[PDB]
């Protein structure tokens, strides 16, 4: 906050939902709660400019959990190279693939 009356008065108005690892109704996880716990707990008391450097590995994983860019891009390589093998008959699917 520009004027952090939040901290001075010691009463919460907005930080409850600011992160998904905070308190949740009936204790349900926010999908990537495990990863962002590591990143935030990496970044406390480190400073903004420092934390972006050292806590980069934690942030990259947390983005990959949240954003899920490369994981399905790799899965794209799974499917694209799959149909580019079945179409010429080079690959046959085992029977657990169907039922």
């Amino acid at each position: 906050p520009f004027f952090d009356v939040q901290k001075r008065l010691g009463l919460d108005l907005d930080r409850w939902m600011t992160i998904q690892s905070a308190e949740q109704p009936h204790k349900i996880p926010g999908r990537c709660h495990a990863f962002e716990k590591e990143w935030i707990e990496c970044a406390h008391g480190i400073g903004g400019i420092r934390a972006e450097k050292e806590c980069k590995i934690e942030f990259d994983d947390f983005v990959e959990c949240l954003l899920r860019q490369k994981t399905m891009k790799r899965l794209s390589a799974i499917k694209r190279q799959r149909d580019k093998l079945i179409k010429e008959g080079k690959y046959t699917p085992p029977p657990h693939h169907l039922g």
Partner: protein
């Protein structure tokens, strides 16, 4: 970065309990009340290890004790069970409310024939400890080393040297 370890399909092959939902829910109270320690061991392992592959063995025992529970009742009044779980099946939401007499029929063998007891409301929801063997994981989250916090300020807050030091302002 690197291979992700996956348990082989060999030890993965485990006797799966081949019963439906109605039979499970009808005897759920007695099943939870009697064979519960292996469930608690596996339940604690899943929340502490946070890694499913670490506690797969305890998962087998969770099923294994389930077969033992179903085996004992099979030797006992299986016919009242067939009556009990069929009427439970005939409920869209599987409500225990409709099935009361057949529920009593099942309950009145196990109390004396099997020596069991229907758990009242609350005991199955009680938060209970479990005496286990597996030690506490060193760091279940697999946390890495923390960055060193910047050193904090120390020393008496001395006056600014030679005033404001902003252009010609002497003080």
């Amino acid at each position: 970065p690197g291979i992700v370890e996956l348990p082989t399909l060999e030890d993965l092959k485990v006797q799966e309990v081949k019963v439906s939902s109605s039979v499970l829910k009808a005897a759920a109270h007695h099943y939870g009340a009697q064979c519960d320690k292996p469930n608690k061991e596996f339940m604690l392992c899943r929340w502490e290890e946070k890694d499913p592959r670490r506690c797969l063995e305890e998962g087998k025992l969770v099923n294994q004790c389930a077969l033992d529970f179903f085996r004992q009742i099979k030797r006992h009044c299986a016919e009242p069970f067939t009556e009990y779980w069929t009427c439970i099946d005939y409920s869209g939401l599987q409500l225990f409310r409709h099935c009361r007499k057949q529920q009593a029929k099942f309950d009145e063998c196990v109390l004396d024939k099997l020596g069991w007891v229907r758990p009242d409301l609350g005991e199955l929801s009680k938060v209970t400890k479990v005496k286990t063997d597996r030690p506490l994981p060193e760091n279940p989250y697999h946390s890495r080393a923390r960055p060193e916090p910047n050193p904090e300020a120390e020393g008496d807050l001395k006056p600014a040297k030679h005033g404001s030091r902003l252009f010609f302002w002497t003080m």
